[PDB]
């Protein structure tokens, strides 16, 4: 459930697949790349929950720099249905 930051980076690059991971790694220096390939090489099995957790945190971080302009309704819809399911969500916001 609590994932070390080195494993998070390895899970993300495995999830990208080799052609896209290699392109990402060209933005990193030689010594960083060598440590990352060692973490990737010993990553073992990735659980579905690890993968989903890493991807969720990654997306939040990547959008941090982005200016937001509305879109709040779709955002609230996803929050409500993940938190409570759509049938309960309908009643929370009041029939």
């Amino acid at each position: 459930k609590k994932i070390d930051g080195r494993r998070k980076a390895a899970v993300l690059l495995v999830a990208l697949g080799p052609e896209k991971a290699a392109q990402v790694m060209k933005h990193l220096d030689e010594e960083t790349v060598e440590q990352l390939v060692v973490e990737i090489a010993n990553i073992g099995r990735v659980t579905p929950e690890e993968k989903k957790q890493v991807l969720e945190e990654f997306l939040s971080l990547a959008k941090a720099k982005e200016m937001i302009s509305e879109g709040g309704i779709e955002y609230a819809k996803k929050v409500l249905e993940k938190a409570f399911g759509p049938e309960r969500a309908r009643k929370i916001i009041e029939r």
Binding site: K8, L12, A15, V24, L28, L36, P48, L55
Partner: protein, 35 residues
Amino acid sequence: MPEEKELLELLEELENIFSRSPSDIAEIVRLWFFE
């Protein structure tokens, strides 16, 4: 497979980010790996 459906959704967003800027992904890789 509902759980699989939301995984493909997350992967699609990841793909979209990649096609816009691989360097934004590298930045988060850096952040994570060094603590």
